[PDB]
Amino acid sequence: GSSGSSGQKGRVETRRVVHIMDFQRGKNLRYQLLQLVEPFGVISNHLILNKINEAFIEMATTEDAQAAVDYYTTTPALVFGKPVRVHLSQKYKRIKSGPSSG
C-alpha cells in the first residue's frame, strides 16, 4: 500500500510479538499459526484479524518468539502447504488482560 520503510538493524530484547503474514485460513487455522511458536515456547496471547491474513502471537518470553523467527530464516515456513512470512514485531502492550478489574 503506502505504509512502510526499509532499513535493517541488529536485535532487541523487548516484549514478544511474532507477526505472521501471507498465511491462509480454513480448518484449524489458528493452530497452523500457533504451531509456528508452540513448539518454540509457551503461548501467552495470540490475535487473528478477521479482515486479512495478518496475525500476531505473543510468547511468555522474548526468547521463544525470537527463536520462532530464526526458524523462518533458516527453514521455509509452509502454512497449510504454502509459504508465508514471519517477523518479530513489538506491539500490542497486552493483547489480552486478566479478569482482575472490578
Short mmCIF file of C-alpha atoms in Angstrom, two decimals, residues 52-102:
data_model
loop_
_atom_site.label_atom_id
_atom_site.label_comp_id
_atom_site.label_asym_id
_atom_site.label_seq_id
_atom_site.Cartn_x
_atom_site.Cartn_y
_atom_site.Cartn_z
CA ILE A 52 -6.91 -10.02 6.22
CA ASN A 53 -4.12 -12.59 6.55
CA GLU A 54 -2.50 -10.73 9.44
CA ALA A 55 -1.94 -12.45 12.78
CA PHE A 56 0.25 -11.84 15.83
CA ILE A 57 1.32 -14.25 18.57
CA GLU A 58 2.69 -13.21 21.97
CA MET A 59 5.07 -15.50 23.84
CA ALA A 60 5.75 -15.64 27.58
CA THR A 61 9.43 -14.96 26.91
CA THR A 62 11.04 -12.98 24.10
CA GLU A 63 13.48 -15.89 23.90
CA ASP A 64 10.69 -18.01 22.42
CA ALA A 65 9.28 -15.66 19.79
CA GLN A 66 12.80 -14.71 18.71
CA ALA A 67 13.56 -18.40 18.20
CA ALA A 68 10.42 -18.97 16.13
CA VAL A 69 11.80 -16.34 13.76
CA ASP A 70 15.25 -17.89 13.40
CA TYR A 71 13.34 -20.89 12.05
CA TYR A 72 11.88 -18.87 9.18
CA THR A 73 15.27 -17.55 8.08
CA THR A 74 16.90 -20.98 8.13
CA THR A 75 13.85 -23.08 7.25
CA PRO A 76 10.89 -22.30 4.96
CA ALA A 77 7.65 -21.87 6.91
CA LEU A 78 4.95 -23.55 4.83
CA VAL A 79 1.48 -22.91 6.23
CA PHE A 80 -1.28 -25.23 5.02
CA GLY A 81 1.20 -26.23 2.33
CA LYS A 82 2.03 -22.76 1.03
CA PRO A 83 4.86 -20.39 2.04
CA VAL A 84 4.28 -17.47 4.41
CA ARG A 85 6.05 -14.64 6.23
CA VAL A 86 7.26 -14.43 9.83
CA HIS A 87 8.73 -11.49 11.74
CA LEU A 88 9.47 -10.39 15.31
CA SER A 89 7.40 -7.24 15.84
CA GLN A 90 6.80 -5.47 19.15
CA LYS A 91 3.28 -4.09 19.51
CA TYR A 92 0.08 -4.65 21.48
CA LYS A 93 1.19 -3.91 25.04
CA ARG A 94 -1.21 -6.56 26.34
CA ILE A 95 -3.19 -8.31 23.61
CA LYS A 96 -5.30 -9.61 26.49
CA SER A 97 -5.68 -8.88 30.21
CA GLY A 98 -6.83 -10.87 33.23
CA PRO A 99 -10.30 -10.91 34.82
CA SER A 100 -8.83 -8.85 37.66
CA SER A 101 -10.55 -5.49 37.19
CA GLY A 102 -13.65 -4.59 39.19
#
